[PDB]
Scaffold this active site. Structure first.
Site, PDB file in Angstrom:
ATOM      1  N   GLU A  80      21.677 -16.350  36.136  1.00 26.60           N
ATOM      2  CA  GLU A  80      20.454 -17.133  36.039  1.00 26.60           C
ATOM      3  C   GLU A  80      19.629 -17.152  37.319  1.00 26.60           C
ATOM      4  O   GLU A  80      18.465 -17.564  37.292  1.00 26.60           O
ATOM      5  CB  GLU A  80      20.787 -18.559  35.593  1.00 26.60           C
ATOM      6  CG  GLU A  80      21.315 -18.600  34.173  1.00 26.60           C
ATOM      7  CD  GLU A  80      21.981 -19.904  33.861  1.00 26.60           C
ATOM      8  OE1 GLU A  80      23.055 -20.188  34.437  1.00 26.60           O
ATOM      9  OE2 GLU A  80      21.407 -20.654  33.057  1.00 26.60           O
TER      10      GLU A  80
HETATM   11  N1  PCD Z   1      28.804 -11.588  42.316  1.00 28.55           N
HETATM   12  C1  PCD Z   1      28.690 -11.119  41.059  1.00 28.55           C
HETATM   13  C2  PCD Z   1      28.304 -11.972  40.025  1.00 28.55           C
HETATM   14  C3  PCD Z   1      28.230 -11.464  38.733  1.00 28.55           C
HETATM   15  N2  PCD Z   1      28.496 -10.168  38.512  1.00 28.55           N
HETATM   16  C4  PCD Z   1      28.420  -9.659  37.144  1.00 28.55           C
HETATM   17  O1  PCD Z   1      27.196 -10.085  36.571  1.00 28.55           O
HETATM   18  C5  PCD Z   1      27.373 -10.529  35.215  1.00 28.55           C
HETATM   19  C6  PCD Z   1      26.940 -11.986  35.087  1.00 28.55           C
HETATM   20  O2  PCD Z   1      27.929 -12.817  35.695  1.00 28.55           O
HETATM   21  P1  PCD Z   1      27.750 -14.411  35.735  1.00 28.55           P
HETATM   22  O3  PCD Z   1      26.571 -14.730  36.630  1.00 28.55           O
HETATM   23  O4  PCD Z   1      29.067 -15.010  36.061  1.00 28.55           O
HETATM   24  O5  PCD Z   1      27.270 -14.796  34.256  1.00 28.55           O
HETATM   25  P2  PCD Z   1      28.150 -15.005  32.907  1.00 28.55           P
HETATM   26  O6  PCD Z   1      28.650 -16.419  32.895  1.00 28.55           O
HETATM   27  O7  PCD Z   1      29.104 -13.856  32.716  1.00 28.55           O
HETATM   28  O8  PCD Z   1      26.956 -14.768  31.855  1.00 28.55           O
HETATM   29  C7  PCD Z   1      26.092 -15.833  31.462  1.00 28.55           C
HETATM   30  C8  PCD Z   1      24.656 -15.550  31.910  1.00 28.55           C
HETATM   31  O9  PCD Z   1      24.316 -14.197  31.582  1.00 28.55           O
HETATM   32  C9  PCD Z   1      22.911 -13.969  31.716  1.00 28.55           C
HETATM   33  N3  PCD Z   1      22.631 -12.545  31.700  1.00 28.55           N
HETATM   34  C10 PCD Z   1      22.378 -11.910  30.556  1.00 28.55           C
HETATM   35  N4  PCD Z   1      22.288 -10.567  30.548  1.00 28.55           N
HETATM   36  C11 PCD Z   1      22.069  -9.901  29.394  1.00 28.55           C
HETATM   37  N5  PCD Z   1      22.026  -8.557  29.440  1.00 28.55           N
HETATM   38  N6  PCD Z   1      21.882 -10.526  28.226  1.00 28.55           N
HETATM   39  C12 PCD Z   1      21.924 -11.869  28.117  1.00 28.55           C
HETATM   40  O10 PCD Z   1      21.720 -12.449  26.931  1.00 28.55           O
HETATM   41  C13 PCD Z   1      22.187 -12.674  29.320  1.00 28.55           C
HETATM   42  N7  PCD Z   1      22.257 -14.033  29.320  1.00 28.55           N
HETATM   43  C14 PCD Z   1      22.157 -14.721  30.620  1.00 28.55           C
HETATM   44  C15 PCD Z   1      22.605 -16.172  30.625  1.00 28.55           C
HETATM   45  S1  PCD Z   1      21.641 -17.290  29.801  1.00 28.55           S
HETATM   46 MO1  PCD Z   1      22.772 -19.366  29.838  1.00 28.55          MO
HETATM   47  O11 PCD Z   1      23.882 -19.131  28.318  1.00 28.55           O
HETATM   48  O12 PCD Z   1      21.242 -20.113  29.266  1.00 28.55           O
HETATM   49  O13 PCD Z   1      23.331 -21.110  30.776  1.00 28.55           O
HETATM   50  S2  PCD Z   1      24.053 -18.219  31.518  1.00 28.55           S
HETATM   51  C16 PCD Z   1      23.710 -16.573  31.303  1.00 28.55           C
HETATM   52  C17 PCD Z   1      28.844 -10.329  34.889  1.00 28.55           C
HETATM   53  O14 PCD Z   1      28.971  -9.045  34.264  1.00 28.55           O
HETATM   54  C18 PCD Z   1      29.487 -10.312  36.259  1.00 28.55           C
HETATM   55  O15 PCD Z   1      30.760  -9.638  36.252  1.00 28.55           O
HETATM   56  C19 PCD Z   1      28.885  -9.323  39.566  1.00 28.55           C
HETATM   57  O16 PCD Z   1      29.122  -8.119  39.345  1.00 28.55           O
HETATM   58  N8  PCD Z   1      28.972  -9.811  40.822  1.00 28.55           N
END
Ligand code: PCD
Ligand code: FES
Ligand code: FES
Ligand SMILES: [Ca+2]
Ligand SMILES: [Cl-]
Ligand SMILES: [Cl-]
Ligand SMILES: [Cl-]
Ligand SMILES: [Cl-]
Ligand SMILES: [Cl-]
Ligand SMILES: [Cl-]
Ligand SMILES: [Cl-]
Ligand SMILES: [Cl-]
Ligand SMILES: [Li+]
Ligand SMILES: [Mg+2]
Ligand SMILES: [Mg+2]
Ligand SMILES: [Mg+2]
Ligand SMILES: [Mg+2]
Ligand SMILES: [Mg+2]
Length: 907
Positions: free
Chosen positions: A869
């Site tokens: 993320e």
């Molecule tokens: N230092 C480091 C860290 C990490 N990695 C790689 O890279 C991947 C990732 O890991 P992580 O950060 O521990 O994660 P996970 O627990 O396994 O998975 C879950 C995420 O995963 C992402 N990315 C992606 N891509 C794709 N192609 N498609 C999709 O649908 C998706 N979804 C998105 C979301 S939305 Mo939430 O359930 O809203 O709280 S939380 C989330 C894996 O294969 C591992 O082994 C490496 O190589 N190194």
């Protein structure tokens, strides 16, 4: 009907078809070529690309009447197979182009069409081609796909040996940190990985295919259901309603907060008393085919009393608003944040204050594969569900009471899946298919079309936000105030938790000693909230990171320097009062600074009267883990043949659960010299794999990675021979010694945030990053083009660089969508990829740059944090900050549609 004799994948086919039939259906259903993937079914995604007489066409919008006798068709199966891979397929594997893999066959077939017409394309030629042919990818950000095409072309052109497309084991022998390909890549690039719809075609004739009878209004009392006409229609077996549900007919939120005013049992499986949102499933038609089920579902008559609907948080939150869930207030949860001293006096006496009102909306996940699941009664008497669940144990407990089963009588399994980006942290179709399997005793299969994927899966929850900073003239932050209103639609699951994310992440990145804020969760009749990658941070940090630039502006300070002044350093605490575990932001900023300065200079030089360039910065932070002392479990097993199976329920959205398992285990097993190809992973199954937990909160690499590490360490100990070396399987079995060894790991140093103050230590590992966006705004139209994105990323240590590069590129691309084009506000208009602003390749710059500035985490496996993320935490803030840099316009309410920007330019 007509006979057509054609050639498919080099083989003469004597075809018998309806001239009106779609080529996609003919290839998939009549010929079994399930490597032709179908997502949108509307010619917008390219997943179903095939070559027809030298042209790349979308099979889903090509009728058989367009295929002449003698035609030549090529599908992915004709490009290459396992052990007979085409250079394009080898290149895809080497460059990590298959994440979820759902778009891979379409891109590869399309790319072959390109190379057959233009043997030596430029990168721009490749991008132009994929734009023209509508090849859409939601995982990779396109760059790795272009990399793969170029490399394949060089081989086909004789510039490098084809063996260079094969991974070479690194000089240091370390798989951890390398570009080792993911185990599932070959299957993905050959179209031999069966996703849920593919499995449906390969289920036996006894299978019933379901269609949903759905609400066509947003809010109603239900009076009755008439299924009579539907029962008389072709292929119809029965119609399922709430009356067929054997349990509570409610999904439980399971971990509903105590101060939530609702009991968490608000969501029906099949609506009985009320419609709560457009799309709610009221009944299921069971038939011999999807087409027949859908036709009959249209004839099921639902007698409704339509009610006024509240289609936004502010509307539903009005003091005099009618309760959507009678007996529970629409505003059902609040989370305060109370850190340090009262902010009022501090704002009053501060050198500078700023405030803003911001909005981030109902972003649609838009995986290329629409939701699909199936269920059946096993010979063991248990009900089995196979779906896109990314939390199989979680979902088992959320749905069991509702469907009327004890936990040991239901088994959930994760199918291979074409992306979710969080929507599958929620149950979608699991309870529906379980109810139908239980009621009929037959296997059942349910595939959503793309409109149902848009209208009737959960969404990022919109937040209306007001945030304020107080600071000294030198830029030192003194205090913050925050208010946020979370529109969670009608179903409460994890809405309170999402609201708490605002206390954790608004203003994250900086030392802010004094904070007073309040988040509120409100039920509405718009789409219910399901996790979307970033889960609260994209809202929170859009507000705070835009506000930082506003503060910089008011101080006459550069916005990167303002961040440098305030960024976490030893002694500081985050908004919940916890000390960060590493301090990489100053390092990242220092390394970015000259690139930022050079980007500013370039923007000034290359701007014209009509096309204004700008550069924007933001910081991103997010936890790796579920709140508190999260935990995981893995089993490491030495098999008879000397391979090792690492058993987990690490659910694969497509992010790389397979390679995470193999890479982490390989590193842990090095003392025993275990080759990576000898390490096997397990697909998530609640009956046969341990409760590793859901793939949410960017947690698996940390939690399950640690559990795998521990399990492997424990297996090493189990295999250790007196005097040195290791016992073989045969030796262990002859000594009656164990060969399947458990490992557990817990983030014991974490604590849940307090219900009154919001203070706590919710995660032991966080992800930290710094974004830079480079954009051009056409000031005549208001159209923004993102020309470059850079992410400085501290991931601690990389398990696999193909995985992490891909994660970052994918997240940055979703950031571009969130910033400029994406929403789900209009139920009909936004129910297609193009309608909802899906980013096609030309919207994503080829310049996506990553700089890893890794500070090993004390609690991460081999020092790793998560990544998933991080790249969506605030890239849209950097983009909007860049529009401001370019033009002086600040967009406060996303997305920055061209007309919206133009109105601001002209104000
Ligand atoms: N230092 C480091 C860290 C990490 N990695 C790689 O890279 C991947 C990732 O890991 P992580 O950060 O521990 O994660 P996970 O627990 O396994 O998975 C879950 C995420 O995963 C992402 N990315 C992606 N891509 C794709 N192609 N498609 C999709 O649908 C998706 N979804 C998105 C979301 S939305 Mo939430 O359930 O809203 O709280 S939380 C989330 C894996 O294969 C591992 O082994 C490496 O190589 N190194
Ligand atoms: S273009 Fe054919 S399935 Fe999307
Ligand atoms: S790999 Fe392209 S959509 Fe997932
Ligand atoms: Ca039939
Ligand atoms: Cl015909
Ligand atoms: Cl290149
Ligand atoms: Cl490598
Ligand atoms: Cl609480
Ligand atoms: Cl106060
Ligand atoms: Cl000062
Ligand atoms: Cl605005
Ligand atoms: Cl517009
Ligand atoms: Li899991
Ligand atoms: Mg060959
Ligand atoms: Mg200080
Ligand atoms: Mg310096
Ligand atoms: Mg609108
Ligand atoms: Mg206007």
């Amino acid at each position: 009907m007509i006979q057509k004799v054609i050639t498919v994948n080099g083989i003469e086919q004597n075809l018998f078809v309806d001239a009106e039939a779609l080529l996609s259906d003919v290839l998939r259903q009549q010929l079994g070529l399930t490597g032709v993937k179908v997502g949108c079914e509307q010619g917008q995604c390219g997943a179903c690309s095939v070559i027809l007489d030298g042209k790349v066409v979308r099979a889903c919008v090509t009728k058989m009447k367009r295929v002449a006798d003698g035609a030549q068709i090529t599908t992915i199966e004709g490009v290459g197979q396992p052990e007979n891979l085409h250079p394009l397929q080898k290149a895809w594997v080497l460059h990590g182009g298959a994440q979820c893999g759902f778009c891979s066959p379409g891109f590869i077939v399309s790319a072959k069409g390109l190379l057959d017409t233009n043997a030596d394309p430029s990168r721009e030629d490749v991008r132009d081609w994929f734009q023209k042919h509508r090849n859409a990818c939601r995982c990779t950000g396109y760059k790795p796909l272009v990399d793969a095409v170029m490399d394949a072309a060089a081989v086909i052109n004789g510039k490098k040996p084809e063996t260079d497309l094969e991974f070479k084991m690194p000089a240091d022998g370390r798989i951890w940190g390398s570009k080792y390909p993911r185990p599932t890549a070959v299957a993905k690039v050959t179209g031999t990985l069966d996703y849920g719809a593919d499995l449906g075609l390969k289920m036996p004739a006894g299978t019933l295919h379901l269609a949903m009878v759905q609400a066509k209004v947003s809010h109603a009392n239900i009076k009755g259901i008439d299924t009579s006409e539907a029962l008389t229609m072709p292929g119809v077996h029965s119609v399922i309603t709430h009356k067929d549900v054997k349990g509570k007919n409610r999904i439980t939120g399971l971990i509903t907060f105590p101060t939530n005013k609702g009991d968490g049992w608000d969501r029906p499986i099949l609506c009985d008393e009320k419609v709560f949102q457009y799309g709610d499933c009221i009944a299921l038609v069971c038939a011999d085919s999807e087409a027949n089920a859908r036709a009959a579902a249209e004839k099921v008559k639902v007698d409704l009393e339509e009610l006024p609907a509240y289609m936004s948080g502010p509307a539903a939150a009005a003091e005099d608003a009618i309760e959507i869930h009678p007996g529970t207030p629409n505003v059902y949860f609040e989370q305060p944040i109370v850190k340090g001293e009262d902010t009022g006096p501090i704002f009053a006496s501060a050198d500078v204050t700023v405030e803003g009102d911001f909005y981030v909306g109902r972003q649609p996940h838009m995986p290329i594969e629409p939701d699909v699941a199936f269920a059946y009664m096993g010979d063991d008497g248990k009900c089995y569900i196979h779906s896109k669940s990314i939390g199989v144990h979680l979902h088992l407990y959320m749905i069991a009471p509702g469907v009327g089963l004890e936990p040991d009588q239901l088994v959930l399994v994760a199918n291979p899946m074409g992306g979710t980006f969080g929507y599958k942290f929620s149950p979608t179709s699991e309870a529906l298919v379980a109810v139908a399997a239980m009621a009929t005793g037959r296997p059942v299969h349910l595939r959503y079309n793309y409109q149902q994927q848009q209208q009737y899966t959960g969404k990022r929850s919109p937040w209306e936000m007001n945030v304020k900073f107080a600071a000294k003239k030198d830029g030192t932050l003194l205090a913050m105030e925050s208010d946020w209103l979370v529109d969670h639609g009608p179903y409460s699951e994890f809405g309170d938790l999402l609201t708490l994310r605002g206390a954790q992440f608004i203003g994250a990145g900086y030392n802010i000693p004094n904070i007073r804020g309040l988040g509120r969760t409100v039920a509405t009749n718009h789409v219910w909230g399901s996790a979307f990658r970033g889960y609260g941070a994209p809202q929170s940090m859009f507000a705070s990171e835009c506000l930082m630039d506003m503060l910089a502006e008011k101080l006459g300070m550069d916005p990167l320097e303002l961040r440098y002044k305030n960024a976490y350093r030893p002694g500081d605490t985050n908004p919940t009062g916890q000390e960060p575990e590493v301090f990489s932001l100053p390092d990242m900023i220092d390394q970015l600074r000259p690139k930022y300065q050079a980007a500013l200079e370039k923007a000034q030089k290359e701007s014209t009267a009509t096309h204004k360039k700008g550069v924007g910065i933001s910081i991103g932070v997010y936890g790796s883990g579920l709140d508190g002392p999260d935990a995981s479990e893995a089993w490491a097993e030495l098999n008879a043949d000397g391979t090792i199976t690492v058993h987990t329920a690490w659910e694969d959205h497509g992010q790389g659960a397979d390679i995470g398992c193999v890479g982490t285990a390989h590193e842990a097993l090095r003392p025993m010299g275990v080759a990576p190809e000898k390490i096997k992973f397990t697909w998530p199954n609640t009956a046969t794999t341990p409760n590793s937990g859901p793939s949410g909160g960017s947690r698996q690499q940390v939690m399950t990675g640690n559990a795998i590490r521990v399990a492997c360490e424990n297996l090493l100990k189990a295999c250790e021979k007196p005097g040195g070396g290791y016992y073989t399987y045969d030796e262990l079995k002859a000594a009656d010694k164990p060969t399947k060894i458990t490992g557990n790991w817990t983030a014991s140093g974490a604590t849940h945030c307090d219900a009154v103050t919001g203070l706590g230590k919710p995660f032991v590992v966080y992800m930290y990053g710094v974004f830079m966006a480079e954009v051009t705004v056409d000031v005549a139209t208001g159209q923004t083009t993102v020309d470059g994105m850079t992410l400085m990323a501290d991931l601690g240590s990389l398990c696999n660089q193909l995985a992490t590069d891909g994660q970052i590129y994918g997240g940055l691309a979703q950031g571009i969508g969130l910033a400029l084009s994406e929403d789900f506000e209009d139920i009909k208009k936004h129910a297609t990829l193009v309608g909802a602003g899906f980013p096609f390749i030309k919207q994503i710059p080829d310049k996506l740059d990553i700089v890893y500035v890794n500070h090993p985490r004390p609690d991460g496996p081999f020092g790793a944090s998560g990544v998933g993320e991080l790249p969506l935490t605030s890239p849209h803030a950097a983009i909007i900050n860049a529009i401001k840099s370019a033009t002086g316009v600040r967009i406060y309410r996303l997305p920055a549609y061209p007309e919206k920007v133009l109105e601001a330019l002209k104000a």
